Amino acid sequence: MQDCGLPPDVPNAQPALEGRTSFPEDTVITYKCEESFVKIPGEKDSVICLKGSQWSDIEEFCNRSCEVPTRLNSASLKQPYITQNYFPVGTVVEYECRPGYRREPSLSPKLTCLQNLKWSTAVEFCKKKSCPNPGEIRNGQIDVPGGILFGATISFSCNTGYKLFGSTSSFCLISGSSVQWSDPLPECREIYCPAPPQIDNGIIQGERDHYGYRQSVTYACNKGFTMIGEHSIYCTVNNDEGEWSGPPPECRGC
Amino acid sequence: QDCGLPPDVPNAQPALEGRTSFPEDTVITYKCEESFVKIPGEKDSVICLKGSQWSDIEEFCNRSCEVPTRLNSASLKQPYITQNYFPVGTVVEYECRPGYRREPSLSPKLTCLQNLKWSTAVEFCKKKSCPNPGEIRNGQIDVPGGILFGATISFSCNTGYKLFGSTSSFCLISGSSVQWSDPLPECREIYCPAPPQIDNGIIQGERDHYGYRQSVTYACNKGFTMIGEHSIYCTVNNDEGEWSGPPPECRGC
């Protein structure tokens, strides 16, 4: 009769019958691979009802493949693997470095789909690029806790008696073609104490315009006056603020 | 042949030894009464002569000041320093003791006043001053009470420095002047012991010396995680350098 019965049984595939058991001549039935199976590119996945109530032949067209290679932050799949989804056992794909990573020549940038439907062990075939030498801060220091490679962080400090002006840290970020420091080297500025205090009936011996950390000012009483106290005070520097070591002496008369 | 009582001399008293009769040739000496001093080059005694007659004697006592009181700033000049006769109007001269100096604007003279008292005393001989103490680098000099003769001064060394030498100085009289008993001490920078190195980590830019408040920063080698403070700093404790705490640790991953 001008009708075919059930289409052939294909291993690891299921036909779409749309709720019927009888099909008219020329009816085309498509099969869908079952779970954990991917259709093999360049293969028939459907049958057709021909004359005599006979279906056209169809061969197994499903496998048995790995999943799409896992997402790496250092490397991207090369074409054409980056657009594929069919990865039967033995399939080997190639990677290429992302930015800012570069090839580690001693290691292969290839992964293979293993018998267990898993990709081979990952190695660091694409390593992190390195930022330029941080350099130096005059009268300050740079803290490099964990190298200067892509993603690294560094901090800046200013030695005792100096005040930091600018960024207090820097990160090695990807900069277009390469990786560069997010922020420039700051400045360590000399902290000044407030002008030294003057005293009644006494003077400051050779007063300077500016006084820095540990710099001292010496007092002297006027003729006829007796000094009671410290002959000199010095600049103490704490939490980036200048402050004199103590009060100035006193000059008592007569 | 015996003389009777010797003549009455104003402001003087004779020494009779309880006697009322005296044999020829007896010599009787008089002593000036209180507040009175015998006048140099004058007779103070009488003698019993023939005819039961005493030799003549004239008043020989002039009211006089006492020997000037001792001053610690000056001393009587010669010849006043050996005199005891100071009638009203007598003016003596002083000269400075050590360690004192003359106050040009003033007079070093005292006058015996009508009331038998010396004139008002002024500071004509003033305490000498030692030279300006000067400066101690990285230290201080405390001048509690001036730098005149007899004064004391103390020395200290700022935080992070240790004093080496004298801790005080006294203004002494030194021959023809006054000088500080002790020379200035030196304030030397205290160094902490070399910072400790750590396994699988380094010191970032180690220095040769570390002083007070100076810090050393650590960094772990690739593949190691730091455990503890990233940097430590040089503390000072009774002139000794000591690190703020232990260095971090670098744990294998």
Swiss-Prot record, chain B:
GO terms for biological process: complement activation, classical pathway; innate immune response; negative regulation of complement activation; positive regulation of CD4-positive, alpha-beta T cell activation; positive regulation of CD4-positive, alpha-beta T cell proliferation; positive regulation of cytosolic calcium ion concentration; positive regulation of T cell cytokine production; regulation of complement activation. Disulfide bonds join C3-C48, C32-C61, C65-C112, C96-C125, C130-C171, C157-C187, C192-C234, C220-C250. GO terms for molecular function: lipid binding; virus receptor activity. The Ser/Thr-rich domain is heavily O-glycosylated. Keywords: Blood group antigen, Cell membrane, Complement pathway, Disease variant, Disulfide bond, Glycoprotein, GPI-anchor, Host cell receptor for virus entry, Host-virus interaction, Immunity, Innate immunity, Lipoprotein, Membrane, Receptor, Repeat, Secreted, Signal, Sushi. It comes from the Eukaryota. Residues 2-63, 63-127, 128-189, 190-252 form the Sushi domain. Glycans are attached at N62. Changing C234S: In CHAPLE; increased complement activation. One of its GO terms (cellular component) is transport vesicle. Expressed on the plasma membranes of all cell types that are in intimate contact with plasma complement proteins. It is also found on the surfaces of epithelial cells lining extracellular compartments, and variants of the molecule are present in body fluids and in extracellular matrix. This protein recognizes C4b and C3b fragments that condense with cell-surface hydroxyl or amino groups when nascent C4b and C3b are locally generated during C4 and c3 activation. Interaction of daf with cell-associated C4b and C3b polypeptides interferes with their ability to catalyze the conversion of C2 and factor B to enzymatically active C2a and Bb and thereby prevents the formation of C4b2a and C3bBb, the amplification convertases of the complement cascade. Belongs to the receptors of complement activation (RCA) family. The first Sushi domain (SCR1) is not necessary for function. SCR2 and SCR4 provide the proper conformation for the active site on SCR3. It is linked to Complement hyperactivation, angiopathic thrombosis, and protein-losing enteropathy: An autosomal recessive disease characterized by abdominal pain and diarrhea, primary intestinal lymphangiectasia, edema due to hypoproteinemia, malabsorption, and less frequently, bowel inflammation, recurrent infections, and angiopathic thromboembolic disease. Patients' T lymphocytes show increased complement activation causing surface deposition of complement and the generation of soluble C5a. Monomer (major form) and non-disulfide-linked, covalent homodimer (minor form). Interacts with ADGRE5. (Microbial infection) Interacts with coxsackievirus A21, coxsackieviruses B1, B3 and B5 capsid proteins. This is Complement decay-accelerating factor. The gene is CD55. The chain holds residues 35 to 285 of 381 of the full protein.
